[PDB]
Write a protein that binds this ligand. Sequence first.
Ligand code: PIO
Ligand code: CA
Ligand code: CA
Ligand code: CA
Ligand code: CA
Ligand code: CA
Length: 750
Amino acid sequence: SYYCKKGVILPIWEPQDPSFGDKIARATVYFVAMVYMFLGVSIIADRFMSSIEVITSQEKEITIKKPNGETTKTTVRIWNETVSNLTLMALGSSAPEILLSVIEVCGHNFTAGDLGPSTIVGSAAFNMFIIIALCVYVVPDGETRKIKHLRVFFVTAAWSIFAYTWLYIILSVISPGVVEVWEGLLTFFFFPICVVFAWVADRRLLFYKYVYKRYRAGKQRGMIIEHEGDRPVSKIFFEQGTYQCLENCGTVALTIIRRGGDLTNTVFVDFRTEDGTANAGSDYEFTEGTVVFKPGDTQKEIRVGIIDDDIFEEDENFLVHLSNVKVSSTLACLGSPSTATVTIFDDDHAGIFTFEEPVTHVSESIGIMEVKVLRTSGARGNVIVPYKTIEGTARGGGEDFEDTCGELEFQNDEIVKTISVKVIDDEEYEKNKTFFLEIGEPRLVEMSEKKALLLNELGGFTITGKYLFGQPVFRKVHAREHPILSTVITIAPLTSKEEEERRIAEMGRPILGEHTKLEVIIEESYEFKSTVDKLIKKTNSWREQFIEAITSCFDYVMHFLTVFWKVLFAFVPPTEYWNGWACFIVSILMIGLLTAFIGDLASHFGCTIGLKDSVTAVVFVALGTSVPDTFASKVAATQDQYADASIGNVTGSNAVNVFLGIGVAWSIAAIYHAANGEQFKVSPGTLAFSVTLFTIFAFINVGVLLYRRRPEIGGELGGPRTAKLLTSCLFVLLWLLYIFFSSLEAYCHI
Ligand SMILES: CCCCCCCC(=O)OC[C@H](COP(=O)(O)O[C@@H]1[C@H](O)[C@H](O)[C@@H](OP(=O)(O)O)[C@H](OP(=O)(O)O)[C@H]1O)OC(=O)CCCCCCC
Ligand SMILES: [Ca+2]
Ligand SMILES: [Ca+2]
Ligand SMILES: [Ca+2]
Ligand SMILES: [Ca+2]
Ligand SMILES: [Ca+2]
């Protein structure tokens, strides 16, 4: 219409419908005042967001070292991006729309206007489309961003869309045309469910999975934001005369060469093995054979079996004798190296256990660390190595490292085993705390029966089904373990040759190596050190704020253009006072009153031109009051390793807008009206179409965002220039279509 109801603050222009031309003279003043008024919100909401950053920040103390002997004391704070803190920043960034809704309801005798809910729905569509398109385009070329937690995005996106479809439910589906107390109070109570869900999610996400932390410089002077980030007779003789074969080869391949004379001859030669150091039948199979040289053949290959057992022995040798050379159908004479001496190298040492290095320097960012324990010089048997951690300078009670005391078990032919130690991340700027880790005397456990007799073990033996080298593997039973006591079997004038065998076999038990005590020196985290060094390199309070308020030509124009708001908001107390709360109380009022002014302007620029409140809520006020959100979303998209916070801010703001603003405003109106005895009325016809259109387009937006999860695209946000431009153009087109159709239906064109 063309009659204007009185504002909360501003009174009506006394001439009404004056002329076709005078409407311009009033409307340009109203619109210019609104546009210049939005800058005040854009600045004071930034300061309010800074204050609410200060409120939820952990304090840290830094002892800065410099070439002077004295070390300076500096305080830096560490605001951590978490789902709970992003919701508070989103609510803080989303405060103007909530205060606009509350003031719009309360000012006009508790009667709902179009402006309040309509600017919330318009800001919802703006937040979902235009800000996400901007976040798509601001990621630099050659870089992409991916949502680390897709399931968090799902739950949050579903909750965000569910808020608006619930708005449609209470306006049209359930109890149409009215808003009862049980509807508005429930819609308000939905928000604590969201914040408890955020708190539960933050605790579960941090505890369940360790997150690598990266520190970047904050917006303020002394804040360090931390975020999760990514981390010529014929002669017969041996070819060699000396052979070297391991015990576990199974067969040693001897070779016999016939040379000279004539190839076309038939001769017989008999090879038999003879006892040397290695005994026949126990270490080498007694192989006696006869071979014949076919005519035209020079070499003949023979094999001798090597018996493998688990007992440690020294190097041994056995001989091979050739004899009885005969000529079939003198002519054949034996070569000079007739006899061969085969040597067996036993390799049944149980091991030598060493730490890799005597000292390692580590930071707390490693979290769980692995320390190798090398087992050299042998592999046979199964060996337990006890290990423990000793507190040095670093006191250990789970505050600096977890006390681990265990027993490593080295299986057969297992060389490297890892000790897992937990280091608590204190994220201190500089510390040099040390703790030791020591391995005790190792004991062999499982063995064959013959080795058990040779080592003269007396303990209880449980027979295991595993077969090694054709013999059963018995295991010594620890006193803690409780067998049936019927399964266990005790194996339990020596010839003075068997004593020597026992002495040689006794050298096979596991021993310790050179390094038994590893000193781990905990050094400072590299990310925090680099961040603080960069911050120092890049580098009372009332006075400083005032002179910084009053300070290339484009910068001069912008500064002069906003000098009124900067001077006025320099009267806001600095964020150091009252732990930040001094700003928090004073800034929000400076929003509220200011926000009230916007409403009156939006109530009058509509009536002067003849523009409905729904349209001027959708296109003008929604764009003006959502500009504090887009800066946070853009910075979070640009700086983060993973762009979870950028989309999360949009989604949290879109949920918080409804659940706070429409919640408290409509609940207060419903309580007042129901107590007074008159039912509270809201016409759902205009808002129902807009909320349905927003839901339909939000599903498309979510689908298009999920389409970029393919490895061809690269990530959720950014990537190749073509995909960036296509996605941004699609989102801007979607927002344009939304506002065009909503504005057309508001004028009943449909
Ligand atoms: C509306 C009610 C909702 C109730 C459920 C509420 C669900 C909810 O909000 O959970 C928050 C949290 C989010 O974690 P989310 O799963 O989003 O993140 C995954 C995980 O936490 C790690 O970040 C990644 O593994 P890793 O550590 O890097 O190896 C993993 O793989 P990648 O993609 O990064 O490679 C990530 O996808 O936990 C769950 O979702 C697990 C639910 C398990 C049960 C799910 C079924 C209930
Ligand atoms: Ca209802
Ligand atoms: Ca032997
Ligand atoms: Ca042997
Ligand atoms: Ca062997
Ligand atoms: Ca052996």
